[PDB]
Amino acid sequence: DVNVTSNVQAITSPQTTTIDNQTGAVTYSNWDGKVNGTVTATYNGQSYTATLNETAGKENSRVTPWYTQDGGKTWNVLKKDGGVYRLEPAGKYQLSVNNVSFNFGTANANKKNITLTSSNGVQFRENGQWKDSIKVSTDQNGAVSQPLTLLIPITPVDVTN
Ligand code: NA
């Protein structure tokens, strides 16, 4: 059993401060978010960093941000605005990335039906759905045999908090 945890953090900062002079209230706007961190897997007591495909071809790993306007019934691709990503604090966002792997080492070679799960909301693409678990195999080197597509949740933390 593998526990896939996310350490992906989103830090967001306001470019504009507004003061309503009828009340004195301060309002922050024009958010400028930046995502950082990694996804780690814990297996048999050791931790492994998710890897991304960096080739020129089609299998190159693609990081795509998503935002919902409702509670989660509609998601769309978060496009840049003013050359930045407008991540609003406490806003529901998700990251999708394809062709992820793990290198579990030669001690974990030729294992079959290893169960991937997550303790903080990471989901795995398979059969057109997002699932909370998936089975994978390792090759002769201990690397996961098939490319993995993850959905990584992120809640941006307000730097002004
Ligand atoms: Na005033």
Author numbering: 50 to 210
Q: What sentences appear in the manuscript?
A:
The arrangement and architecture of SlpA_ac and SlpA_amy are highly similar. The N-terminal part, exhibiting the first two domains (SlpA_I and SlpA_II), is known to be responsible for the self-assembly of the S-layer protein into a regular lattice. The crystal structures of SlpA from L. acidophilus and L. amylovorus and observed crystal contacts reveal the self-assembly formation. A second interaction was observed within this crystal structure, a symmetrical homodimer interaction spanning from Asn92 to Asn176. The self-assembly region (SA) is formed by domains SlpA_I and SlpA_II, building a 2D crystalline network that forms the exposed surface of the SlpA layer.
S-layer proteins (SLPs) are self-assembling, crystalline proteins coating the cell surfaces of many prokaryotes. We determined the atomic resolution structures of all functional domains (I-III from N- to C-termini) present in the three S-layer proteins SlpA_ac, SlpX_ac, and SlpA_amy. The Lactobacillus S-layers are anchored to the cell wall through interaction with teichoic acids (TA), either lipoteichoic acid (LTA) or wall teichoic acid (WTA).
